[PDB]
């Protein structure tokens, strides 16, 4: 199963 990495960049 995939590691969940912290978000470091977002978009919108």
């Amino acid at each position: 199963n995939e590691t969940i990495y912290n978000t470091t960049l977002k978009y919108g």
Partner: antibody
Amino acid sequence: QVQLVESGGGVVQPGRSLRLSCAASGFTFSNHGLHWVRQAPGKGLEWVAVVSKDGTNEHYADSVRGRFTISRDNSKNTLYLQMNSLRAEDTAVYYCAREGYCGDDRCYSGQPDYWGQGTLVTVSS
Amino acid sequence: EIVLTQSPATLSLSPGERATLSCRASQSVGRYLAWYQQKPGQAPRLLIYDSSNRATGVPARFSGSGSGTDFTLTISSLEPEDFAVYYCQQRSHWPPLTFGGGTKVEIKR
């Protein structure tokens, strides 16, 4: 297993164009952002571009903005780099790399975790 | 951009010895710093992320440390397959995603 296979590199003259492809398998393609990273002969790694997991957002290294376009087709599990206005300094092996999952929202991790084998682009007159 | 400075350029060591590699940042990246291994002709392989977390299949002899602007990768006892080039990479402030210039761990004779 995660698999990433890049193609499209070749000898190209300055000012002309080349298109790189990277085909992916072994993971949920639409869950991950995708990067291109290059390595000039005898030099280190340099980031090129990224595209969001849904293909609606992208970012570029300053030195390729207006020249390279990154895109993806989630229907074909394929990542692209359209390379225009090529210059001698673009000569490098180009790697495609997925980044780690960050969640369900409009996010990037910025953490490459699997890399392809690289495709060589040689820009020369 | 956040510039990463790696030192030394070359580490010359024998199998079984400890290797310690430095990566410094031009401003704080918190703990968002990763390390890769690359052998000639091959693609980079992720070893460490978030300064000290080991990635899949990475043996215990590799350890990462640091925060802010000061980071190290330690190989407690070099194996023959460990002689390669190592790169650090930050993800705190991007784009651009930035890489250090690399450290070559080579065989001493």
